[PDB]
Design a protein around this motif. Structure first.
Motif, PDB file in Angstrom:
ATOM      1  N   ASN A  97      35.213 -68.635  24.075  1.00  0.00           N
ATOM      2  CA  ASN A  97      34.982 -68.067  22.724  1.00  0.00           C
ATOM      3  C   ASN A  97      35.572 -68.623  21.742  1.00  0.00           C
ATOM      4  OD1 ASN A  97      35.316 -64.365  23.637  1.00  0.00           O
ATOM      5  ND2 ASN A  97      33.640 -66.051  23.832  1.00  0.00           N
ATOM      6  N   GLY A  98      36.699 -69.468  21.645  1.00  0.00           N
ATOM      7  CA  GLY A  98      37.454 -69.876  20.861  1.00  0.00           C
ATOM      8  C   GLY A  98      38.616 -68.852  20.576  1.00  0.00           C
ATOM      9  N   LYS A  99      38.473 -67.544  20.707  1.00  0.00           N
ATOM     10  CA  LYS A  99      39.490 -66.480  20.625  1.00  0.00           C
ATOM     11  C   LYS A  99      40.788 -66.579  21.013  1.00  0.00           C
ATOM     12  N   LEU A 100      40.866 -67.507  22.019  1.00  0.00           N
ATOM     13  CA  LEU A 100      42.145 -67.776  22.777  1.00  0.00           C
ATOM     14  C   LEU A 100      43.059 -68.473  21.735  1.00  0.00           C
ATOM     15  CD1 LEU A 100      44.345 -67.421  24.891  1.00  0.00           C
ATOM     16  CD2 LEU A 100      43.261 -69.414  26.080  1.00  0.00           C
ATOM     17  N   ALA A 101      42.643 -69.537  20.915  1.00  0.00           N
ATOM     18  CA  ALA A 101      43.294 -70.507  20.327  1.00  0.00           C
ATOM     19  C   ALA A 101      43.400 -69.542  19.147  1.00  0.00           C
ATOM     20  CB  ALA A 101      42.280 -71.521  19.743  1.00  0.00           C
ATOM     21  N   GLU A 102      42.741 -68.612  18.376  1.00  0.00           N
ATOM     22  CA  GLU A 102      43.143 -67.691  17.617  1.00  0.00           C
ATOM     23  C   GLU A 102      44.388 -66.818  18.008  1.00  0.00           C
ATOM     24  N   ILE A 103      44.284 -66.268  19.062  1.00  0.00           N
ATOM     25  CA  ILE A 103      45.085 -65.302  19.653  1.00  0.00           C
ATOM     26  C   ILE A 103      46.515 -66.072  19.915  1.00  0.00           C
ATOM     27  CG2 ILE A 103      45.580 -64.560  21.988  1.00  0.00           C
ATOM     28  CD1 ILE A 103      42.863 -63.493  22.118  1.00  0.00           C
ATOM     29  N   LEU A 104      46.587 -67.478  20.280  1.00  0.00           N
ATOM     30  CA  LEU A 104      47.815 -68.091  20.423  1.00  0.00           C
ATOM     31  C   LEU A 104      48.411 -68.454  19.113  1.00  0.00           C
ATOM     32  CD1 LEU A 104      46.770 -69.958  23.618  1.00  0.00           C
ATOM     33  CD2 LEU A 104      48.536 -68.523  23.365  1.00  0.00           C
ATOM     34  N   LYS A 105      47.561 -68.693  17.843  1.00  0.00           N
ATOM     35  CA  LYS A 105      47.974 -69.436  16.646  1.00  0.00           C
ATOM     36  C   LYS A 105      49.580 -68.895  16.325  1.00  0.00           C
ATOM     37  N   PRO A 106      49.923 -67.651  16.422  1.00  0.00           N
ATOM     38  CA  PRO A 106      51.182 -67.403  16.189  1.00  0.00           C
ATOM     39  C   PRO A 106      52.576 -68.035  17.040  1.00  0.00           C
ATOM     40  CG  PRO A 106      50.175 -65.346  17.107  1.00  0.00           C
ATOM     41  CD  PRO A 106      49.068 -66.559  16.517  1.00  0.00           C
ATOM     42  N   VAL A 107      51.961 -68.169  18.351  1.00  0.00           N
ATOM     43  CA  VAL A 107      53.008 -68.869  19.450  1.00  0.00           C
ATOM     44  C   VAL A 107      53.294 -70.178  18.748  1.00  0.00           C
ATOM     45  CG1 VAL A 107      53.382 -69.437  21.761  1.00  0.00           C
ATOM     46  CG2 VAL A 107      51.711 -67.588  21.239  1.00  0.00           C
ATOM     47  N   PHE A 108      52.349 -70.914  17.887  1.00  0.00           N
ATOM     48  CA  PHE A 108      52.677 -72.143  17.127  1.00  0.00           C
ATOM     49  C   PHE A 108      53.300 -72.029  15.843  1.00  0.00           C
ATOM     50  CE2 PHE A 108      50.930 -74.505  20.848  1.00  0.00           C
ATOM     51  CZ  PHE A 108      49.951 -73.797  21.274  1.00  0.00           C
ATOM     52  N   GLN A 109      53.099 -70.885  15.325  1.00  0.00           N
ATOM     53  CA  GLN A 109      53.587 -70.633  13.877  1.00  0.00           C
ATOM     54  C   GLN A 109      55.138 -70.768  13.791  1.00  0.00           C
TER      55      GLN A 109
END
Length: 109
Positions: A97-109
């Motif tokens: 979906n690409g949705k996981l990378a969005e969902i994970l974005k904070p984990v990298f912030q």
């Protein structure tokens, strides 16, 4: 079944880290899910809590609590940001979906 206190504690475990995986050893899709998160998607391990339920004396009650919490009976059981993602199939769906990378974005912030 499981006590409300066990459920609360397992919820607490779930919300401690950005990424939570309840897994078991010798679990092909647990390995898949862990590899996806940590190897493919480079989720910082310091931002994850991975439980191996069959390596824990309380693993069975954790699993029951997890089922009480989500209705999910299978491992792996993935939460991200304290929110239920599901199992490996869900993770894969979100990965695609690409949705996981969005969902994970904070984990990298």
């Amino acid at each position: 079944m499981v006590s409300q206190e066990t459920v609360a504690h397992v919820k607490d475990l779930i919300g401690q880290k950005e990424v939570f995986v309840a897994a078991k050893t010798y679990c092909p899709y647990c390995k898949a899910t862990l590899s996806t998160l940590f190897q493919e998607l480079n989720v910082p391990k310091s931002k994850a809590l991975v439980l191996e339920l069959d390596e824990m004396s309380n693993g069975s009650e954790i699993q029951d609590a997890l089922e009480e919490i989500s209705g999910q009976k299978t491992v792996p059981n993935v939460y991200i940001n304290g929110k239920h993602i599901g199992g490996n199939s869900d993770l894969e769906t979100l990965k695609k979906n690409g949705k996981l990378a969005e969902i994970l974005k904070p984990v990298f912030q």
